[PDB]
Write a protein that binds this ligand. Structure first.
Ligand code: GSH
Lengths: 241, 62
């Protein structure tokens, strides 16, 4: 996260960190039930002689605050049982950039470990609304990750505006969230993490999945996120959640 | 060919994963770490330092 601040301990109990073998943190994910996480499909594609699609290659850290304190009280370590990349995921256009991750063993609910709410297919996160992006990703593009979980407040951008900023590249599956000014945005290491939206009773719903961007926090290049509502049924069909 | 695998400058790309990788820097004849996004990288992109060193051994700017 560029231009964010330190998160308070257990402020985002659905934020998950995914580590690939001998590589450390690669991507974020969100806890959605005792057994399932939502993440980005591009995180789990075989490349350079490593099987990122092989569930055995990953470790998930739930209730993590600081990457240097992975053994702190309440941090839960979990292996993966299966990875479901969306059938329509396109590695050239980044369309349908969403994945489901099955925990080998259920998460134990606590004040640091708690699922995020999922929106119904008909629910709209309205343009202009303030939502949060969280992650251990870079605090500058071409920079370095943060040890302490970062949070940044960004705003939902109209699809037409989004399309015009990034011509021929945005699909109905994608949503621009950020600022035309830049300054606050997700960055490398943030992929697969949830957009958190405070709703009517204060409960937080997942608005999207960190996916891609043209650098980080640049003017007229806001973050591109995978929308959640249109995947509600696909999620249910595959997970029972 | 060494053009692509060794002389190309490192490409982070647009995806926002943090994949620790290695590229060859032909100005210093040394492999250095960078962070790949996950998407549409070029060939100067290696999983391991030793794979980078090996592929690009004896390579100079032309
Ligand atoms: N009391 C329920 C927990 C219900 C729960 O954790 N709700 C979640 C998922 S809808 C939630 O409100 N998370 C978002 C938030 O706390 O704002 C249980 O025993 O499992």
């Amino acid at each position: 996260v560029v231009g964010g601040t330190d998160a308070d301990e257990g402020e985002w109990p659905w934020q998950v960190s995914l580590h690939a073998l001998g590589q450390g943190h690669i991507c974020g994910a969100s806890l959605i039930s005792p057994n399932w996480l939502v993440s980005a499909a591009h995180c789990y594609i075989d490349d350079r002689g490593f099987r990122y699609s092989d569930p055995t290659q990953w470790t998930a850290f739930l209730g993590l605050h600081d990457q240097s304190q992975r053994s702190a009280p309440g941090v839960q370590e979990r292996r993966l049982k299966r990875i479901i990349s969306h059938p329509f995921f396109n590695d050239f256009t980044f369309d349908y950039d969403i994945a489901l991750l099955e925990l080998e063993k259920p998460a134990e609910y606590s004040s640091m470990v708690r699922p995020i709410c999922l929106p119904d297919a008909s629910h709209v996160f309205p343009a202009g609304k303030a939502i949060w992006v969280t992650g251990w990703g870079h605090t500058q593009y071409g920079g370095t990750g943060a040890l302490i979980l970062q949070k940044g407040e960004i705003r939902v951008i109209q699809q037409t505006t989004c399309e015009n900023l990034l011509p021929q590249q945005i699909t109905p599956r994608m949503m621009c969230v950020g600022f035309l000014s830049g300054g606050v945005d997700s960055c490398q290491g943030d992929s697969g993490g949830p957009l958190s939206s405070v709703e009517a009773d204060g409960r937080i719903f997942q608005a999207g999945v960190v996916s891609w961007g043209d650098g980080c926090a640049q003017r007229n290049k806001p973050g591109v996120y995978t929308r959640l509502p249109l995947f509600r049924d696909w999620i249910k069909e595959n997970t029972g959640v | 060919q060494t053009e692509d695998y060794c002389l190309a400058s490192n490409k982070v790309g647009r995806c926002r994963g943090s994949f620790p990788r290695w590229y060859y820097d032909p100005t210093e004849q040394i492999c250095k770490s960078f962070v790949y996004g996950g998407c549409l990288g070029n060939k100067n992109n290696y999983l391991r330092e030793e794979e980078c060193i090996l592929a690009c051994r004896g390579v100079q700017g032309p």
